[PDB]
Swiss-Prot record, chain A:
Name of this chain's protein: Superkiller complex protein 2
Task of the protein: Helicase component of the SKI complex, a multiprotein complex that assists the RNA-degrading exosome during the mRNA decay and quality-control pathways. The SKI complex catalyzes mRNA extraction from 80S ribosomal complexes in the 3'-5' direction and channels mRNA to the cytosolic exosome for degradation. SKI-mediated extraction of mRNA from stalled ribosomes allow binding of the Pelota-HBS1L complex and subsequent ribosome disassembly by ABCE1 for ribosome recycling. In the nucleus, the SKI complex associates with transcriptionally active genes in a manner dependent on PAF1 complex (PAF1C).
Disease with which this protein is associated in UniProt: Trichohepatoenteric syndrome 2: A syndrome characterized by intrauterine growth retardation, severe diarrhea in infancy requiring total parenteral nutrition, facial dysmorphism, immunodeficiency, and hair abnormalities, mostly trichorrhexis nodosa. Hepatic involvement contributes to the poor prognosis of affected patients.
Domain of life, per lineage: Eukaryota
Included range, full protein: 998 to 1097 of 1246
Swiss-Prot record, chain B:
Function statement: Component of the SKI complex, a multiprotein complex that assists the RNA-degrading exosome during the mRNA decay and quality-control pathways. The SKI complex catalyzes mRNA extraction from 80S ribosomal complexes in the 3'-5' direction and channels mRNA to the cytosolic exosome for degradation. SKI-mediated extraction of mRNA from stalled ribosomes allow binding of the Pelota-HBS1L complex and subsequent ribosome disassembly by ABCE1 for ribosome recycling. In the nucleus, the SKI complex associates with transcriptionally active genes in a manner dependent on PAF1 complex (PAF1C).
Subunit organization: Component of the SKI complex which consists of SKIC2, SKIC3 and SKIC8. Interacts with PAF1.
Record gene name: SKIC3
Disease (UniProt): Trichohepatoenteric syndrome 1: A syndrome characterized by intrauterine growth retardation, severe diarrhea in infancy requiring total parenteral nutrition, facial dysmorphism, immunodeficiency, and hair abnormalities, mostly trichorrhexis nodosa. Hepatic involvement contributes to the poor prognosis of affected patients.
Location(s), subcellular: Cytoplasm; Nucleus
Recorded family membership: Belongs to the SKI3 family.
TPR repeat coordinates: 20-54, 56-90, 91-124
Portion of the full-length sequence here: 771 to 902 of 1564
Protein's name in the database: Superkiller complex protein 3
Tissue: Widely expressed with the highest levels observed in vascular tissues, lymph node, pituitary, lung and intestine. Not expressed in the liver.
Length: 100, 132, 100
């Protein structure tokens, strides 16, 4: 971080906008738009699907299904999957035992 | 005559198909049932064009198209594919494609169609018979 | 806006300005958050005070409060002698752009 600070100081000491005639106004407008855009981005993330805490675990579960023969690519149930659907408990182990 | 709807058109086509099938199966004639088959195709095509978003009409046209007297397999394959696309949950259409592939010496691809079809409906009889 | 020319680095400079500040604050946390900083903070210490009250005025700490949980530093800080008695002269001004 300190090295990044040093490099940022080095870059800050050479800006061309500081010498531009229209430095303050355009800059404040840029501040407003970036702040608002960032707030929108966070808002959309809260409104998106990645906000769900358990989504990576859902993906991991579908992958575990796909390595065995229960779900086709793009999520269509296979015969073993529909067999393990109507099962009381330990669906995976019992249906795997049946096919083996 | 007094109420022109699509379902009656499709049923009329199926009835003409049955009459032709009966005449052929008793060896009673051949090449004298041609008009009956063309009438059947005409009725099914009229029904399909009347409402071309129904898997039933595409499926019926496909099955008739592959009758031994007509023997137009490309149209049958097209009709079954259209029926499958129209409504994806269709074991009947998949099994009919499986039969089409199986009779024309395509064991692998017919196996693919039958296995997927029973994947969609585990208690359909014809898919199991095809697998056997 | 149009940034072609003297304004080319105006947004990127801005980014360099923003990120840098968080780093000082991170550094600033790593200043107050450290046990050794918490030990150095005592009498005989000169500090730079930055808030709405003191804007980078140099101050010298007189004492550190005994409750090191709520660390209240009684500190002598220089400010302009108030040549006024009325809070009405303070009003919103141009948003201070970060210069080099």
């Amino acid at each position: 971080g300190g090295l990044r600070a040093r490099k940022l100081e080095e870059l800050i000491q050479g800006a061309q906008c500081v010498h531009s005639p229209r430095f303050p106004a355009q800059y404040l407008k840029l501040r407003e738009r970036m702040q608002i855009q960032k707030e929108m981005e966070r808002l959309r993330f809260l409104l998106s699907d990645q906000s769900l805490l358990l989504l990576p675990e859902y993906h991991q579960r579908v992958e575990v299904l796909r390595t065995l023969g229960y779900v086709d690519e793009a999520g269509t149930v296979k015969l073993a999957g529909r067999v393990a659907c109507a099962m009381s408990s330990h669906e995976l182990l019992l249906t795997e035992l049946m096919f083996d | 005559k007094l109420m022109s709807t699509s379902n009656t058109w499709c049923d009329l086509g199926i009835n003409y198909y049955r009459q032709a099938q009966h005449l052929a199966e008793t060896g009673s004639n051949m090449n004298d049932l041609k008009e009956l088959l063309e009438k059947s195709l005409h009725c099914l095509k009229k029904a399909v064009r009347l409402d071309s978003n129904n898997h039933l009409y595409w499926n019926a046209l496909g099955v008739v198209a592959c009758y031994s007297g007509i023997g137009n397999y490309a149209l049958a394959q097209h009709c079954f594919i259209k029926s499958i696309q129209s409504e994806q949950i269709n074991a009947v259409a998949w099994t009919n494609l499986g039969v089409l592939y199986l009779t024309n010496e395509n064991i692998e691809q017919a196996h693919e169609a039958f296995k997927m079809a029973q994947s969609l409906d585990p208690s359909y009889l014809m898919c199991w018979i095809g697998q056997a | 806006p149009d940034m072609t020319g003297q304004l080319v680095d105006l947004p990127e400079y801005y980014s360099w300005g923003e990120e840098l500040t968080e780093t000082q604050h991170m550094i600033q946390r790593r200043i107050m958050e450290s046990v050794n900083g918490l030990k150095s903070l005592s009498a005989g210490r000169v500090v730079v005070v930055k808030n709405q009250e003191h804007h980078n005025a140099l101050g010298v700490i007189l004492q550190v409060s005994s409750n090191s949980t709520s660390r209240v530093f009684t500190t002598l800080v220089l400010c302009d002698k108030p040549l006024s008695q009325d809070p009405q002269d303070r009003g919103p001004a141009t948003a201070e752009v970060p210069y080099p």
